[PDB]
């Protein structure tokens, strides 16, 4: 288990997201699904020149898995995944000028996605976020942060995932509506209706 | 014809795009198709609760029309379109904060789209851009700029388009590769392959 400091502007953005009231919190689900769709585009693109890219799983889909008992909402996709370097250095698409431009714009939250930092909208609803991921060129890894300016990365020893990413939202006690089948369906319908991959809700036992 | 000053940061971005060398200029086509797709999503959504939104045209598609004779590449869609207010005031999504700071990311051009200003990438390859558009709530208008700090807006009493937008790129003389059928196919394949509306390339 290695522990890292957030890039300064990411820490600032995270505090802003957590410590300020925003009405329109449902957009977190749109942003996560958007990222999953972009990850699916990426592996599909690679698979057109080299079909062996799909040895790790041919299916291209997004699954939403609410769990009232654990107070978790999980977004799973079979996209390209992230390597250890991605998890430690951050993605190329998250640049500090974009992070800065968004925060300036803040002072609607929904504009977050435009600037490449949509993932951090998860902290509108989640007290902790766990990201389990597997990229064809690397091993399976877990990234986790409860904000407060640090995050962790470790090799993952849980269930193998083949290829793709699970983001596990450990929800805030006042944000449990997002575990409700009805609410989830309404949000997907409003914001993610024309995404070009199946989105399937796994109804809880 | 009314002539309008560009917002100051928009003028600066435009001068920058025109007056700086960039290698990977082909991404302009990715940005335009992305906007057309976003505009298609918008009218589609509206039509779900009001079917009459499609009385101006049921088809939801994107057309690419190269014209070697006129040296123009036109990107046409049947998306939601833009009102006169949109054309004069700009879109609410193009914000000083994103414009001022995309320049900061530059100080690759390809991340322009992030910052909400993907359209202006048209000026990597075009000396003039004409935008003809029709929204359900307004008349048909033409916006046009050759840069130099201004744009014009006029009623378009030309060809009725029903609903949607045409972006006509009047290409610089050293940028004519973007009228070649095979170059356009390759750009679509690399960047826009999984857009969720038909993209039709119309032989001249
Ligand atoms: C595959 C790429 C993309 C198309 N999709 C996704 C993108 C993301 C996403 O934003 N991850 C990251 C990288 C990691 C995991 C969450 C957050 C942002 N992290 C980090 C990592 C590091 C830092 C730092 O300050 C380092 C000091 C510099 C900050 N933050 C996610 C989570 C999923 C998908 C998807 N479902 O596939
Ligand atoms: C429907 C909106 C979006 C989803 N799609 C599109 C967006 C655009 C686009 O960016 N247009 C604008 C508004 C007009 C036309 C081009 C440029 C950017 N203009 C202006 C207008 C004004 C200003 C100013 O400085 C004013 C002083 C404040 C600057 N620039 C386009 C072109 C097409 C689509 C699409 N195919 O539908």
From Swiss-Prot, chain B:
Region called Interaction with NR3C1, residue ranges: 1-204
Protein family per UniProt: Belongs to the heat shock protein 90 family.
Swiss-Prot/TrEMBL domain comment: The TPR repeat-binding motif mediates interaction with TPR repeat-containing proteins like the co-chaperone STUB1.
Protein name per the record: Heat shock protein HSP 90-alpha
Binding-site residues, ATP: 35, 77, 96, 119
Gene field: HSP90AA1
Function noted in UniProt: Molecular chaperone that promotes the maturation, structural maintenance and proper regulation of specific target proteins involved for instance in cell cycle control and signal transduction. Undergoes a functional cycle that is linked to its ATPase activity which is essential for its chaperone activity. This cycle probably induces conformational changes in the client proteins, thereby causing their activation. Interacts dynamically with various co-chaperones that modulate its substrate recognition, ATPase cycle and chaperone function. (Microbial infection) Seems to interfere with N.meningitidis NadA-mediated invasion of human cells. Decreasing HSP90 levels increases adhesion and entry of E.coli expressing NadA into human Chang cells; increasing its levels leads to decreased adhesion and invasion.
Residues of the full protein shown: 17 to 223 of 732
Modification sites for N6-acetyllysine: 42, 68
PTM annotation: ISGylated. S-nitrosylated; negatively regulates the ATPase activity and the activation of eNOS by HSP90AA1.
Compartments (UniProt record): Nucleus; Cytoplasm; Melanosome; Cell membrane
Species of origin: Homo sapiens (Human)
Oligomeric and partner information: Homodimer. Identified in NR3C1/GCR steroid receptor-chaperone complexes formed at least by NR3C1, HSP90AA1 and a variety of proteins containing TPR repeats such as FKBP4, FKBP5, PPID, PPP5C or STIP1. Forms a complex containing HSP90AA1, TSC1 and TSC2; TSC1 is required to recruit TCS2 to the complex. The closed form interacts (via the middle domain and TPR repeat-binding motif) with co-chaperone TSC1 (via C-terminus). Interacts with TOM34. Interacts with TERT; the interaction, together with PTGES3, is required for correct assembly and stabilization of the TERT holoenzyme complex. (Microbial infection) Interacts with herpes simplex virus 1 protein US11; this interaction inhibits TBK1-induced interferon production.
